[PDB]
């Protein structure tokens, strides 16, 4: 999988969208696998975090911060932060201005990457993008 090839253009387009301020605190939700096969979740998520830390200079909420925040909110330690209310609950504790959701879907050998950026303050989706993940 060429995750950069998919992720770089989408990050670049997210950074050009109005309402997205570079250098702000961003909570990056782990990439969710909805394909028909197994995918390395945290390898895709690491790529993403890199693309975001390098382009547009966000301060990312760290793994340990998230773990701690989950525990302060009584969530299970492995909680994926699927739902929006859990993500916002967590975002508020850690001081994040944005939440980024992403997921890969469709066929395992030809996934579709989709991403959405949520403004924490209001809960609104201010940006959305999709790209195909090649090899």
From Swiss-Prot:
Interacts with PBP1b. GO terms for molecular function: enzyme regulator activity. It is found in: Cell outer membrane. Its main location: membrane. Regulator of peptidoglycan synthesis that is essential for the function of penicillin-binding protein 1B (PBP1b). The lineage of its organism: Bacteria, Pseudomonadati, Pseudomonadota, Gammaproteobacteria, Enterobacterales. GO terms for biological process: peptidoglycan biosynthetic process; regulation of cell shape. It comes from Salmonella typhimurium (strain LT2 / SGSC1412 / ATCC 700720). It is a lipid-anchor. This is Penicillin-binding protein activator LpoB.
């Amino acid at each position: 999988y060429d995750w950069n090839g998919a992720m770089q253009p989408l990050v670049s387009k997210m950074l050009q969208a109005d309402g997205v301020t570079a250098g702000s605190v961003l909570l990056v939700d782990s990439v969710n696998n909805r394909t028909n096969g197994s995918l390395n979740a945290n390898e895709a998520t690491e790529t993403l975090r890199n693309a975001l830390a390098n382009n547009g200079k966000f301060t990312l909420v760290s793994v340990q911060q998230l773990s701690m925040a989950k525990q302060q909110l009584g969530l299970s330690p492995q909680d994926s932060l699927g739902t929006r209310s859990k993500a916002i609950g967590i975002a508020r504790n850690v001081g994040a201005q944005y939440v980024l959701y992403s997921s890969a879907s469709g066929n395992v050998n030809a996934p579709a990457l989709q991403m959405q950026l949520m403004l924490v303050q209001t809960g609104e989706i201010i940006w959305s993008g999709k790209g195909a993940v090649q090899q």
